[PDB]
Amino acid sequence: MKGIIFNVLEDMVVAQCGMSVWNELLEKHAPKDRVYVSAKSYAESELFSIVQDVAQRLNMPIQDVVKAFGQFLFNGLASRHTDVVDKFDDFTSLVMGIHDVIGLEVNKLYHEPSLPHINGQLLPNNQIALRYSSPRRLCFCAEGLLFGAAQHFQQKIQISHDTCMHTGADHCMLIIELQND
Numbered sequence: 001m002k003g004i005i006f007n008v009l010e011d012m013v014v015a016q017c018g019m020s021v022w023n024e025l026l027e028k029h030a031p032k033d034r035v036y037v038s039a040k041s042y043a044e045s046e047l048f049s050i051v052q053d054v055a056q057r058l059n060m061p062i063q064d065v066v067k068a069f070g071q072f073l074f075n076g077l078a079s080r081h082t083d084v085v086d087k088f089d090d091f092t093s094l095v096m097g098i099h100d101v102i103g104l105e106v107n108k109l110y111h112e113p114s115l116p117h118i119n120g121q122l123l124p125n126n127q128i129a130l131r132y133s134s135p136r137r138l139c140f141c142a143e144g145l146l147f148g149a150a151q152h153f154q155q156k157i158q159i160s161h162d163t164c165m166h167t168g169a170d171h172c173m174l175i176i177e178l179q180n181d
């Protein structure tokens, strides 16, 4: 438990460095007294430092770790909001439906303010254009999630994240393409 985001990640660390390290950087950073749930607040702001700590332990760049957590995050989630997934018959529908159906669905589950700005579209050459913009700059995760989704549905895609606010552009551009286009 403890934050759905931190929950899936907690498990991932239990597999890599183990629960012992998870508690070491957590108790050092996050509170040992305060306990959250897979439905309570989940300030990602703290995550960044967490994915960095563990990254220092795996001796991997923070960008490669966060990316991974994104993939894992889609997996475990498909278990939580599974009913919400069984609404989409394919990877594509999910990409053009993200904020729309999934977001809408989330709102029904809980109040919540507003989800990041996400816009998807379909292309003729079996491609899907996805636009992701958020001040959290968690874009790296975005890719991880998308890549994971496809895999779940036995699909092999490629995401070209050329435009990235990291530069200062209007937003992030994630071009997707289906294998054997």
Ligand code: HEM
Pocket (backbone or CB within 6 Å): 042, 043, 044, 074, 077, 078, 081, 084, 094, 098, 102, 106, 116, 134, 135, 136, 137, 138, 139, 141, 142, 145, 146, 149
């Ligand atoms: C491939 C599909 C999905 C994509 C591409 C996606 C992408 C993202 C991204 C990148 C963020 C914003 C992080 C940020 O701006 O800091 C996010 C947050 C979130 N997503 Fe998804 N998501 C997907 C599916 C879902 C699913 C499985 C659920 C619904 C059950 C969901 C639940 C959430 C929640 C609750 C947050 C946290 C919001 C917050 O803490 O501010 N997403 N997602």
